[PDB]
Design a protein around this nucleic acid. Structure first.
Ligand SMILES: CC[C@H]1OC(=O)[C@H](C)[C@@H](OC(=O)NCCCOCCC#Cc2ccc3c(=O)c(C(=O)O)cn(C)c3c2)[C@H](C)[C@@H](O[C@@H]2O[C@H](C)C[C@H](N(C)C)[C@H]2O)[C@](C)(OC)C[C@@H](C)C(=O)[C@H](C)[C@H]2NC(=O)O[C@@]21C
Ligand SMILES: [Mg+2]
Lengths: 48, 120, 215, 114, 122
RNA sequence: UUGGCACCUCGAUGUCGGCUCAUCGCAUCCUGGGGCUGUAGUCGGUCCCAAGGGUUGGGCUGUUCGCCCAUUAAAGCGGUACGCGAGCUGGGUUCAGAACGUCGUGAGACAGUUCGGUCCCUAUCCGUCGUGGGCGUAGGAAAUUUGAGAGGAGCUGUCCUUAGUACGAGAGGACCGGGAUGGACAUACCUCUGGUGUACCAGUUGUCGUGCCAACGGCAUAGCUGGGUAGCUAUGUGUGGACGGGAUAAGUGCUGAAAGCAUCUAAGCAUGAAGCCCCCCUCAAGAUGAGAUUUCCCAACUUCGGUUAUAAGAUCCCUCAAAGAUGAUGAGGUUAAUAGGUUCGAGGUGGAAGCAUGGUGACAUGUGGAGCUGACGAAUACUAAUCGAUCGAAGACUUAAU
């Protein structure tokens, strides 16, 4: 139950290929033109 | 239904307390799951209020907490009285709804999707 | 010989002649339409494709499988039919009898046939070694620490490996299963329902492919 | 229709001539046993213990004492092996299922009429 | 559902007041039995006298288990106690004043002398 | 197996039984085919072909083993570090305590007994069971697919009939085939019988509180107790291993010579098993050989495509569950029943509250199968799926038909 050997830099960088953050679901707000998250209330204006 | 990451007694209590607070304030801020679960409880209480017969009053007394509101001109009346005298009239003609929900962005301390549940 | 696409509604019971509780699965087969007639020289094997249910027609900006897409509208309009929801085909049937564009009707089955119902099982999700595989689990007392896990996965130095097929934890359900030698107790032509003795695979609101026993 | 179809299919097999009763009633049940010779009738007498969901799937239960040995029989209300039913006397209970009679014998299992 | 190490009451005046079972005849690995099934058993309480005496090994056939039996019409017959009757290796009892009811399913198993010498067939 | 040798391992290769899980050989325990017999058939014995499947539950010992009690068609023999402890136990054995018998003057000792005696580890790699993303399949897509291969099953009893027939002084007593039911085991499902059901109904104890009686809430394992819907389930319900082909094994032959006879063999040609292949269930074109059918999409700048953005199609995002660890799958996004609510209903519980009557009271009766009712069925846009955004083709050469 211990690592029998090192994980080389190649293996490391390989495993984390799919480890990333997604760009937010952002759309432009119709009253102010600033971006907002879709289905959420704009925090700059306060609309829909 | 949902469990809200909590036991039964602690949830029963949280749901009824959150419903009472909503009735007091007419719009509150909370996380999505608890809004989604207080929606039904508050909607059903308003139904118990659209009849106003003593049976429904006594039965709705089960859920609401005993709180006092100071209205304008230092007028005082409790949550039951509000439900049955100021909210029954407003929704005498509407046959559902009674509440809306407006998603907001994630909070800072967690990634919880805060929302505002308001009486419509 | 016969085949119909249907969906499962539930189970009830029928008191048949000589007072016998016949457990039954009601199946709703409605507007089954032939959409093609596969042929040996055109496709290499003779069979017919049946479409079941009824989707709505194409609309611009559709966001769900409720409405047909342009590709499917075309396939069904070549059989003058409405877009359908479930499409399967049958090989046991003899193609000359059928015709492109016909309706397959519940009345294809008479009382007392022998049929095979092929559906998909209900999903149980990620399930342990003993519910998925029927394994006897270990002792619950006498100082045991082996309650539900699977036992040895192999031997020792000989086969210093786990062999393929070792019955280990995974996802149960979602498998095509064919129960064989069931029979139909009644066919109702107005509500469009074929009643089948016994029980069939799948969730309620599913899909079953009834055809004539191959045995 | 995708809902009434179950009842629309079982309606042709539902009886109207059966009476209306409730748990706690001692009722005689006529049954058509088909032996090797004929279909001789025979009578079963008991106290209804419970009854379950509607449709062809309603099943009630009766209980009796044969030779000091409790016996309970469960029937579907629409099985066609019942020739006739008689609610021989009414019963004042306060349950819907009467499981608590499996531990009593004699006057302890008493029922008031009406 | 009757398995080995299950104590049953005897329903005869053969001499055994109560017995327990060892096997359920009928198949390798057979584990349970219901009305109409025969087993092997050794009495544990005998009457003073009687033909069968305490500590003997005997065949017997189940009558009126409390798990009860489904009948082909959806009718179920259940009972309030397990019970059994000793047999003479010919489907024939030993006593002749059998007590307690008996199911009607013993008719099929050709336990007819058991069904004929019975207070109530059911 | 008991050994012999001392070749790897003492900077550690946990050793015996049992549990869980098996897997493979066949010198086969049962089942299938046969030659036989000092085989009349049932009986048995012997040998051959056969490994597809199957090959119990207990009492006694730490025991393997063995004996015994009941069964079964049978209760097979072995390999796998005397399979398997980073899967489990720790009874035996092998630490320190103690004690008896024996040996020793003694400290102590005995593979002589006896009671007691800490089983650690968050899985990197290969392996294995599931489940995603990328890319390739000479355009981009939606659906239906053949099957190269691969996996799973594969067991068998009793009764009746033929038939009390053959065969039998008798006693006993089928072969075949043809019916009917089981055991075990695998699957699918909740209609029935049951289990569970911690946001359903009801009764009840102590105590605190909404001033107060009545009503109700909090806590006491969900306080307890009786029920119980959906879901999930077996012990419950169906289903399955049914035929039937093709090639064979031991074996049985036919015609037939070397060797004018014979003779199963050499030519050839027959028959013959739960065995082989197909047949039956499931997965399967990453089957880089990347397959097939139907349909959908089809322009216009180039200054020469190493080209935008768009089709057809999806996704983002959001309401969800017949699906689910997550992601996938599937039902839906206003041109909308996807979920919540509202209305009606099923099922469950069992006679709500307030009244009036009767009782000293504890209570009872009518209103009124009333009241309540989580997932279950239907209708209804009342509330939320409002707005928007991203990705996504323009089809290579060569030769032959054209
Ligand atoms: C809790 C975490 C710690 O783990 C452990 O205690 C576990 C439990 C221990 O398992 C075992 O007991 N055996 C498995 C059980 C076998 O029973 C049969 C009946 C017996 C006995 C016996 C015999 C002699 C003596 C002895 O003579 C004496 C004295 O004092 O003279 C003291 N007694 C007690 C003896 C008792 C580890 C794993 C143990 O290793 C194992 O021992 C074996 C000797 C060899 C094993 N292999 C090489 C084949 C080996 O794998 C060690 C030695 O620990 C004592 C581990 C070492 C590394 C440690 O020290 C670690 C740091 C532990 N210390 C701690 O704090 O964390 C621990 C992890
Ligand atoms: Mg080392």
């Amino acid at each position: 139950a211990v690592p029998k050997r090192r994980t080389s830099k190649t293996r490391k960088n390989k495993r984390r290929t799919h480890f990333k953050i997604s760009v937010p679901g952002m759309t432009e707000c119709p009253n102010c033109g600033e971006y907002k998250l879709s289905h959420r209330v704009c925090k700059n204006c306060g609309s829909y | 239904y949902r469990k809200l990451g909590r036991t039964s007694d602690q949830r029963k209590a949280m749901l009824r307390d959150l419903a009472t607070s909503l009735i007091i304030s007419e719009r509150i801020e909370t996380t999505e799951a608890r809004a989604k679960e207080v929606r039904s409880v508050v909607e059903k209480l308003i139904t118990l209020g659209k009849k106003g017969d003593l049976a429904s009053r006594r039965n709705a007394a089960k859920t609401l907490r005993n709180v006092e509101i100071l209205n304008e001109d230092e007028t005082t009346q409790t949550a039951l009285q509000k439900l049955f005298g100021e909210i029954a009239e407003r929704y005498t003609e509407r046959q559902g709804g009674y509440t809306r929900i407006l998603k907001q962005g994630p909070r800072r301390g967690d990634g919880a999707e805060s929302v505002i549940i308001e009486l419509v | 010989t016969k085949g119909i696409l249907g969906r499962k509604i539930g189970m009830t019971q029928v008191f048949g002649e000589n007072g016998e509780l016949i457990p039954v699965t009601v199946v709703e087969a409605k507007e089954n339409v032939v959409l093609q007639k596969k042929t040996v020289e055109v496709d290499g094997y003779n069979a017919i494709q049946v479409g079941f249910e009824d989707k709505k027609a194409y609309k611009k900006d559709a966001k769900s499988n409720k409405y047909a897409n342009k590709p499917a509208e075309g396939h069904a309009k070549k059989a003058d039919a409405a877009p359908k929801r479930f499409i399967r085909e049958f090989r046991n049937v003899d193609v000359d009898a059928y015709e492109v564009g016909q309706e397959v009707s519940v009345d294809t089955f008479v009382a007392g046939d022998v049929i095979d119902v092929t559906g998909v099982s209900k999903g149980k999700g990620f399930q342990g070694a003993i519910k998925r595989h029927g394994q006897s689990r270990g002792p619950m007392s006498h100082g045991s620490h082996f309650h539900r896990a699977p036992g040895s996965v192999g031997m020792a130095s000989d086969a210093s490996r786990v062999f393929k097929g070792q019955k280990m934890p995974g996802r149960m359900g979602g498998n095509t299963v064919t129960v064989q030698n069931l029979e139909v107790v009644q066919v109702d032509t107005e509500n469009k329902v074929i009643l089948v003795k016994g029980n069939v695979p799948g969730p309620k609101k599913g899909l079953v492919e009834i055809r004539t026993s191959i045995k | 229709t995708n809902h009434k179809l179950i009842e629309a299919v079982t309606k042709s097999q539902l009886r109207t001539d059966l009476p209306s009763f409730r748990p706690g009633d001692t009722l005689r049940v006529h049954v058509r046993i088909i032996e090797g010779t004929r279909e001789r009738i025979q009578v079963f007498e008991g106290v209804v213990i419970k009854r379950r969901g509607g449709g062809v799937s309603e099943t009630f239960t009766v209980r009796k004492i044969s030779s000091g040995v409790g016996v309970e029989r469960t029937f579907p209300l629409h099985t066609p092996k019942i020739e006739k039913i008689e609610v021989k006397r009414r019963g004042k209970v306060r349950r819907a299922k009467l499981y608590y009679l499996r531990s009593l014998r004699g006057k302890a299992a008493r029922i008031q009429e009406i | 559902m009757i398995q080995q190490e299950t104590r049953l009451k005897v329903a005869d005046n053969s001499g055994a007041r109560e017995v327990l079972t060892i096997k359920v005849l009928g198949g390798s690995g057979r584990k349970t039995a219901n009305i109409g099934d025969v087993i092997v058993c050794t009495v544990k309480n005998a009457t003073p006298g009687g033909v069968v005496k305490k500590g003997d090994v005997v065949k017997a056939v189940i009558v009126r288990t409390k798990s009860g039996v489904r009948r082909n019409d959806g009718s179920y017959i259940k009972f309030d106690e397990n019970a059994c009757v000793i047999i003479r290796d010919d489907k024939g009892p030993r006593g002749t004043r059998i007590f307690g009811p008996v199911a009607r399913e013993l008719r099929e198993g050709n336990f007819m002398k058991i069904v004929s010498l019975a207070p109530e067939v059911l």
